[PDB]
Structure 1
Amino acid sequence: AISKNLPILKNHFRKHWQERVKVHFDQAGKKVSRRNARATRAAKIAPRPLDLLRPVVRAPTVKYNRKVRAGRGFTLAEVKAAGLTAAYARTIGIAVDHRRQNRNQEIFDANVQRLKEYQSKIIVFPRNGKAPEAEQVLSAAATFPIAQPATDVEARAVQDNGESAFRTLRLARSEKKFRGIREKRAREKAEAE
């Protein structure tokens, strides 16, 4: 029934919704179990650091490409540039992604610097050596944090060339909007006589 001045609602409760009500009573319990799972895995794989070294990538879309983040794995080009094989890299804790490609020199250099820097700060115990204890460090990510690069300097000189940035945006829109028609008129004008 429709009554006095109230916003129109859309409460989707016209199925047997009470049969699929999940109440996360176990939030604290699952937290205890997750920390217990982390401690168990830490002991099982000690002295390894509980997570793989991830690369830094750009985020997709125009909404998020201003930021960098952790990616899945280093590309085969990055691993080869860092001086090691993908198969060996996977056994010393480096994530390797065969489907990501390098087209950005800045990101590629950053990941290769990331790989050499990681190599400098790990100890690979020999397969039949003495294997000394090396104070297990739980987080590789906290050891090698992802840094947003520097876009510019804090201050510099005003260079005004009279370009009218707004005019530039307008003209960019117009040239793109009229490229197809102008090429069509160019092609027909060329073909006429």
Structure 2
Amino acid sequence: AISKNLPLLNNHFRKHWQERVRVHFDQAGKKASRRQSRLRKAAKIAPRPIDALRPVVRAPTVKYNRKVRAGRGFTLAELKAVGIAPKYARTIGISVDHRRQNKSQETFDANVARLQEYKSKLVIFDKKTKASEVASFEQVDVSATFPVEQPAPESGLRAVEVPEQTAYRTLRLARNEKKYKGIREKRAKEKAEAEAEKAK
């Protein structure tokens, strides 16, 4: 059962696995039908775009801080800054997210600029609008017309300025301060109460 110099394997096939085998023979068929559904959805509402305008948000965690991606909807504050009510915004191709907020100014400003760019290209028809004007428009792809763009990494030339303390020493001191903050604060509190209680 165990023989030779081989890696030890974990092949989880001790249940009735063959009753739950999903083979994707329909990958191409689903691709084609998905494309047809997409054409039907587009042709139903043309020239109104099929995609709602989405915000741009930083990805969470220390691993994806650097990246920025499309969010779910614009915050109520962001829509407030451009003078659009969320109920109204949902009817002109703008997505709303009541859950997200803006702790910082950078994402808020990016999304306000994005909303103002979309708002400048918007043309809202009405009863007085005739089919000649409506036919003068093409159904654009909002996901491509207002793409999510990564901020460029800093590159190019800058003056070299060397601090006296090295970066490695700074990191070590930060680690040490964090590691001993609690015990140092407890020690200082005890010292202060001792030398200001008996010094009463």
Give the TM-score normalised by structure 1.
0.96
1:76 aligns with 2:76: yes
Q: Which has the larger radius of gyration?
A: 2
- Determine the structure 2 residue equivalent to 1:144: 146
Matches within 5 A, 1:110-129: 110-127=110-127, 129=129
State the shift of 1:123 in Å: 1.3
User: What secondary structure does 1:57 align onto?
Assistant: strand
- Determine the structure 2 residue equivalent to 1:38: 38
1:173 aligns with 2:175: yes
- Determine the structure 2 residue equivalent to 1:107: 107
**CA contact under 8 A between 1:75 and 1:101: conserved in structure 2?**
yes
Give CA-to-partner distance per residue, 1:138-178, whole Å, 9 cap, x none: 41010001111244342211111222000000000000000
1:26 aligns with 2:22: no
Looking at structure 2, the residues matched to 10 and 134 of structure 1 have their Cα atoms a distance apart, in angstroms, of 62
Structure 1: gaps spanning 5 or more residues? none
Amino acid in structure 2 at the alignment position of 1:81: A
Looking at structure 2, the residues matched to 171 and 39 of structure 1 have their Cα atoms a distance apart, in angstroms, of 60
Looking at structure 2, the residues matched to 187 and 47 of structure 1 have their Cα atoms a distance apart, in angstroms, of 70
Runs of 4+ aligned structure 1 residues displaced above 6 Å come to none
Amino acid in structure 2 at the alignment position of 1:124: I
Looking at structure 2, the residues matched to 15 and 116 of structure 1 have their Cα atoms a distance apart, in angstroms, of 57
Structure 2: gaps spanning 5 or more residues? none
Q: Comparing 156-165 with 22-31, which one deviates more in the overlay?
A: 156-165
State the shift of 1:48 in Å: 1.4
CA RMSD of aligned residues (A): 1.3
Amino acid in structure 2 at the alignment position of 1:25: F
Q: Comparing 138-147 with 70-79, which one deviates more in the overlay?
A: 138-147
Amino acid in structure 2 at the alignment position of 1:177: K
User: What secondary structure does 2:57 align onto?
Assistant: strand
Distance 1:179 1:98, change over 3 A: same
Amino acid in structure 1 at the alignment position of 2:66: R
Aligned residues: 193
The percentage of aligned residue pairs carrying the same residue is: 69
**CA contact under 8 A between 1:47 and 1:134: conserved in structure 2?**
no
- Determine the structure 2 residue equivalent to 1:156: 158
